[PDB]
Amino acid sequence: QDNFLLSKEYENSLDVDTKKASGIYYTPKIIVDYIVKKTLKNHDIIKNPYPRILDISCGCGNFLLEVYDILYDLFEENIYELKKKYDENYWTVDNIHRHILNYCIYGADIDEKAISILKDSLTNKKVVESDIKINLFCCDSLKKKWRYKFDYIVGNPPYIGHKKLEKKYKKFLLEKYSEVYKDKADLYFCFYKKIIDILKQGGIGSVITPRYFLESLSGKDLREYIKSNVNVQEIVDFLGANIFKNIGVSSCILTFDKKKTKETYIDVFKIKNEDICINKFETLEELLKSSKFEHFNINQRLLSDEWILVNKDDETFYNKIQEKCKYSLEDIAISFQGIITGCDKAFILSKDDVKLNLVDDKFLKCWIKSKNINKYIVDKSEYRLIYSNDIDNENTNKRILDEIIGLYKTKLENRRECKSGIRKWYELQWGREKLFFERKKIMYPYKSNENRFAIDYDNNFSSADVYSFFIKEEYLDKFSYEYLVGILNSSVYDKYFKITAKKMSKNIYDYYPNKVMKIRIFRDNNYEEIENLSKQIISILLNKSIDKGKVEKLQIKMDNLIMDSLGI
DNA sequence: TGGGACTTTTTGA
DNA sequence: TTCAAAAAGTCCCA
Ligand SMILES: Nc1ncnc2c1ncn2[C@@H]1O[C@H](C[C@@H](N)CC[C@H](N)C(=O)O)[C@@H](O)[C@H]1O
Numbered sequence: 001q002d003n004f005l006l007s008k009e010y011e012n013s014l015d016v017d018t019k020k021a022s023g024i025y026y027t028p029k030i031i032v033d034y035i036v037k038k039t040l041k042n043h044d045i046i047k048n049p050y051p052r053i054l055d056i057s058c059g060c061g062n063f064l065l066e067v068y069d070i071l072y073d074l075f076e077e078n079i080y081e082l083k084k085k086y087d088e089n090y091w092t093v094d095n096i097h098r099h100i101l102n103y104c105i106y107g108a109d110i111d112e113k114a115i116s117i118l119k120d121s122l123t124n125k126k127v128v129e130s131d132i133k134i135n136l137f138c139c140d141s142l143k144k145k146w147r148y149k150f151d152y153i154v155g156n157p158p159y160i161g162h163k164k165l166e167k168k169y170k171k172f173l174l175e176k177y178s179e180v181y182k183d184k185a186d187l188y189f190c191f192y193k194k195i196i197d198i199l200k201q202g203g204i205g206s207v208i209t210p211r212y213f214l215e216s217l218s219g220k221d222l223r224e225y226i227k228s229n230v231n232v233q234e235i236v237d238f239l240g241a242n243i244f245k246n247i248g249v250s251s252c253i254l255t256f257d258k259k260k261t262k263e264t265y266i267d268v269f270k271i272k273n274e275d276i277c278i279n280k281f282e283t284l285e286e287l288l289k290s291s292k293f294e295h296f297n298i299n300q301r302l303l304s305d306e307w308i309l310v311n312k313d314d315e316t317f318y319n320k321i322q323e324k325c326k327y328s329l330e331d332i333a334i335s336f337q338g339i340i341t342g343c344d345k346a347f348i349l350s351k352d353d354v355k356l357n358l359v360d361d362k363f364l365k366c367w368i369k370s371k372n373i374n375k376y377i378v379d380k381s382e383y384r385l386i387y388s389n390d391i392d393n394e395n396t397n398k399r400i401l402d403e404i405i406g407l408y409k410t411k412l413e414n415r416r417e418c419k420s421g422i423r424k425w426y427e428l429q430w431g432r433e434k435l436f437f438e439r440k441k442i443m444y445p446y447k448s449n450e451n452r453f454a455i456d457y458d459n460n461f462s463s464a465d466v467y468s469f470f471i472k473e474e475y476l477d478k479f480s481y482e483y484l485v486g487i488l489n490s491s492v493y494d495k496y497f498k499i500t501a502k503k504m505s506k507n508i509y510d511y512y513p514n515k516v517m518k519i520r521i522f523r524d525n526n527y528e529e530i531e532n533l534s535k536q537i538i539s540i541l542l543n544k545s546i547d548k549g550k551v552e553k554l555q556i557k558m559d560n561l562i563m564d565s566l567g568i
Numbered sequence: 569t570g571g572g573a574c575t576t577t578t579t580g581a
Numbered sequence: 582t583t584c585a586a587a588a589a590g591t592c593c594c595a
C-alpha cells in the first residue's frame with residue numbers, strides 16, 4: 001500500500017488560503033520514516049504491548065499509517081511470545097489489526113474531511129464482526145480536555161504566525177498558553193507545550209517544526225519551557241534546506257523524552273550543504289551518518305536563555321570574541337527601524353516620476369531598499385518618499401492628495417491607526433522622526449547572506465527592510481563610523497554574527513536589532529590601521545571609475561589585523 | 569516546476 | 582503615543 005497517495009491528493013485539492021489558515025501541509029515520507037523509527041525502533045512490545053501513540057494534528061495520517069505498519073510488524077514478530085506471556089486466546093495474528101486500532105493509535109485534527117480519509121485508510125489496512133472503534137478526534141487539540149497521557153507523540157504541528165491567526169483565537173492563546181506564547185509567537189509553540197504536557201513520564205516525543213524558535217526572540221519562553229520540562233535527546237537542524245517542496249520554510253526535528261536520566265546531553269546534527277535534495281535518498285539516517293551532516297553534543301544543563309548549538313571550534317571562537325570585547329553595539333549606539341508607510345505604493349515614487357512635479361521638494365526624501373546596501377556604502381537612491389506627515393491640511397496641498405496619495409485612499413483608510421482616528425488617511429502609519437534619518441548613520445539590510453553594514457552620507461530613508469543606527473555622542477571619541485564598518489564587515493564578524501543569528505531561508509539570515517545590537521566590539525592598538533584600511537576601501541568604492549579589486553586585498557589585511565586583535 | 573533575487577505592513581506591546 | 586518582530590515568505594523565470 002501507498003500511505004502517501006490519498007493524503008497527497010487531498011492536499012493538492014486545497015487552495016493556498018485554506019492551507020495557510022490551517023497549516024495543511026503534509027510531511028514527506030523520508031521525514032515520517034525517520035521520526036517513527038526514532039520513536040519506536042527500540043520499543044519493548046513484550047514488556048508493553050499497549051503503547052499509546054498520538055499525532056495531535058494527524059491530517060490524513062502520514063504519521064499514523066506508518067505507525068500502523070511498524071506496530072503490525074512489531075506484534076507479528078513477537079506474537080508467540082506475547083501468546084505465551086499473556087492471554088493466549090487474545091494474541092493471534094488475526095487479532096493484531098483490531099488490537100492496534102483499539103489501544104495503540106490515536107489521532108486528532110480540526111479537519112473533518114482529513115479525519116474521514118484517515119479513518120477509511122486505517123479501516124482498509126485489513127480486509128474485514130463488530131465495528132472496530134478507532135481513536136480519532138475531530139477537535140481543536142489546544143482546547144481538548146485530554147483524558148490521559150501518551151507513551152509516544154509524533155507529528156508536524158501547524159505553523160501560523162502573528163499575521164495569519166485571528167485576533168479572537170490569539171486572545172485565547174495569550175490567556176491560556178502564556179508560558180510559551182506572547183507577542184509575535186507562533187501557534188506551533190503552543191503545540192510544543194501541549195505535546196510536552198500530555199506525554200507520559202518516560203514517554204518520547206518527536207516532531208518536525210520550523211527551526212526559528214532555536215534562535216528567535218519570540219522563542220525564548222518556549223526554549224525555557226522545553227529545557228525545563230523534557231530531556232532533549234536530539235536536534236536535527238536543516239538550516240536553509242528545502243525539506244517541504246514548494247514551501248518557503250526552514251525546518252528542524254526535535255526528539256525529547258520524560259525519562260528519569262542523569263544524561264542531559266543532546267545530539268545535534270546540522271546540515272553542511274543547504275543545496276542537497278533530501279528526497280533523492282532512501283533514508284534520512286544515511287544522510288545524518290554521512291559527510292553531509294556535522295554532529296556534536298551540547299550539555300543541556302549549560303543552555304542559557306539562548307541555545308548556542310555549535311561545535312567545539314566555533315564555541316571557542318565565539319567565547320574568545322565575547323570575552324575580549326568590552327562593549328556591545330547597544331552600549332554605544334542608538335538603533336531604529338525604518339519608516340513604515342503602511343501602503344508603499346501611495347507614498348513611494350520613482351525619482352523620475354512626473355507626478356513629483358506636483359510635490360514640493362521639502363516633502364521629498366531619498367528612499368533605498370535592502371538591495372541598495374553594500375558593504376561600506378549605499379547605492380544611489382532611485383526612489384523618493386513623500387513625507388506626507390508634513391502636509392498641514394488638505395486644502396493647501398489638494399493636488400498631492402487628489403492625484404498621488406488619494407489613489408489609494410480606501411486602502412489607506414483600512415490601516416489600524418486610521419480606523420481608530422489616530423492617523424489621518426493620508427499620513428504615514430509609522431513616520432518615526434525625520435531627524436533620526438537626516439544624519440550620518442550606519443544602515444544594514446534586514447535579511448542578507450552576509451554582513452553588509454554601510455555608512456549613509458546622504459540622509460537616506462528606508463522602510464523596515466533596512467535598519468539604522470547612529471553612534472551615541474559620548475562614544476564618538478572611542479568609535480568612529482569608519483572603524484565600525486571596518487570590523488563589522490570583516491570575515492571574522494560575519495562568522496561571529498552567524499554563530500547566533502536567526503537562519504531564515506537558504507543564504508538568508510535575519511539582521512534585526514534584537515541580535516545585531518548584541519554584537520560585541522573592541523578597541524586596541526590596531527584601531528588606527530583598521531580605520532585607515534576602512535577609509536581606503538571607502539574611498540575606492542566611492543570613486544566613479546575605480547575598479548574594486550584592491551578592495552579585496554585591503555579587506556584581507558583588515559581581517560588579519562582583526563584576527564590578531566582577537567587572538568583567533 | 570525548482571531555484572534565485574528580493575523583501576510589506578500587520579501586529580502586540 | 583509609538584516602538585520593533587514576524588518567513589508553511591513572494592515572485593519571477595528558464
Ligand atoms: N487547532 C488544531 N487542533 C488540531 N489540529 C489542527 C489544529 N489546527 C490545525 N490542525 C491540523 O494540523 C495539521 C497540520 C498538518 N501539517 C498535517 C500534519 C500531519 N501530522 C502530517 O505530518 O502529515 C493540519 O492537517 C490541520 O488540519
Ligand SMILES: [K+]
Pocket residue numbers: 083084085086087088
Ligand atoms: K499464556
